[PDB]
Amino acid sequence: QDCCLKYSQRKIPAKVVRSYRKQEPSLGCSIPAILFLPRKRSQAELCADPKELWVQQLMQHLDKTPSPQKPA
Numbered sequence: 781q782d783c784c785l786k787y788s789q790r791k792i793p794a795k796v797v798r799s800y801r802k803q804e805p806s807l808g809c810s811i812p813a814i815l816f817l818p819r820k821r822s823q824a825e826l827c828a829d830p831k832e833l834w835v836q837q838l839m840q841h842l843d844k845t846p847s848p849q850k851p852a
Contacts, residue, residue: 783809784827791834792816792826799847800839803827814839 784803796819803813814835816826828835 781808784811784813784815785809786827787813787829787832788826792828792838794838794841796820796823797826797838797842800842801850802830804852 783806797816798819799817801815801817803809803811803815805812812830814828814830816828816838818825830836
């Protein structure tokens with residue numbers, strides 16, 4: 781249902797993220813995005829640009845201990 785419309789203007793450190801998911805372009809949602817899921821429930825999911833180097837780097841570190849992803 782919900783989806784990312786904008787991207788983080790701030791880098792986040794891996795210490796606060798538990799996992800990520802991918803958002804592909806769709807009818808409800810027109811941009812691709814990376815969704816970073818927080819360790820603390822006091823925090824929201826964070827939308828981020830897939831092309832940014834820090835985003836790629838974080839995903840790559842998180843992938844050392846991967847979580848399930850959205851089918852497709």
